Design a protein around this ligand. Structure first.
Ligand SMILES: CC(C)[C@H]1Cc2nc(O)c(C#N)cc2CO1
Ligand SMILES: [Zn+2]
Lengths: 161, 48
């Protein structure tokens, strides 16, 4: 039920998403080990992901959370990188996409830094890098990230070392 | 097989406290609380 619609680079929506990607790159403490060494991206394509069934699934849950949090969904746009991205856009997020060894428990993780999510495109810790060259810092192979609407509701603040 | 958010809470906000330039990370425990709105295809670029 999923349709992907290309956005034009001349579209304000395209440019807005690109700017959020580019502006939230940062340096990482692993020196680039997991996600590669870079200060910016070459954006090749941005597509809108459309699925009526999955959208209604999301809004149904959002309404539950909003009402439980006294009419506040606390909805954000956040990045997510994953080897399972192709499965996520067709079937939706579920337990198969969670991080059991995550700092904050077995749940599904999202980032404000695009470069943080880039560290997970090829798996936890960058896995073995791109399929073709086995290079976590590959500058040739095309990568994909999701930019997702996320309902936080009442969010527990955990300071992290 | 998957975890639960703190009681009374719907998510966790992981906020880096040492690296002042690092932004937050977030965890949800129900997949229905996220929708994949954009798919972005890209390359990382080698610094000049
Ligand atoms: C593939 C699974 C295990 C991985 C994906 C993933 N993607 C992200 O963008 C982030 C972040 N921030 C964390 C994780 C941790 O879980
Ligand atoms: Zn490669």
């Amino acid at each position: 039920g999923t349709i992907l619609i290309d956005l034009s680079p001349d579209d304000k929506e395209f440019q807005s998403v690109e700017e959020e990607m580019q502006s939230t790159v940062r340096e990482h403490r692993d020196g680039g080990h997991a996600g590669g060494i870079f200060n910016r991206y070459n954006i090749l394509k941005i597509q809108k992901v459309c699925n009526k069934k999955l959208w209604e699934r999301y809004t149904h849950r959002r309404k539950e959370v909003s009402e439980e949090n006294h009419n506040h969904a606390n909805e954000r746009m956040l990045f997510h990188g994953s080897p399972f991205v192709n499965a996520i856009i067709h079937k939706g997020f579920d337990e198969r996409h969670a991080y059991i060894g995550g700092m904050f428990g077995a749940g599904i993780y999202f980032a404000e830094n695009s470069s943080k999510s880039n560290q997970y495109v090829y798996g936890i810790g960058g896995g073995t890098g791109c399929p073709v060259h086995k290079d976590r810092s590959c500058y040739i192979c095309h990568r994909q990230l999701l930019f997702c609407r996320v309902t936080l509701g009442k969010s527990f603040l955990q300071f992290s070392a | 097989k998957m975890a639960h958010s703190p009681p009374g809470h719907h998510s966790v906000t992981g906020r880096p406290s040492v690296n002042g330039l690092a932004l937050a990370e977030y965890v949800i425990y129900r997949g229905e609380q996220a929708y994949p709105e954009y798919l972005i295809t890209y390359q990382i670029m080698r610094p000049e």
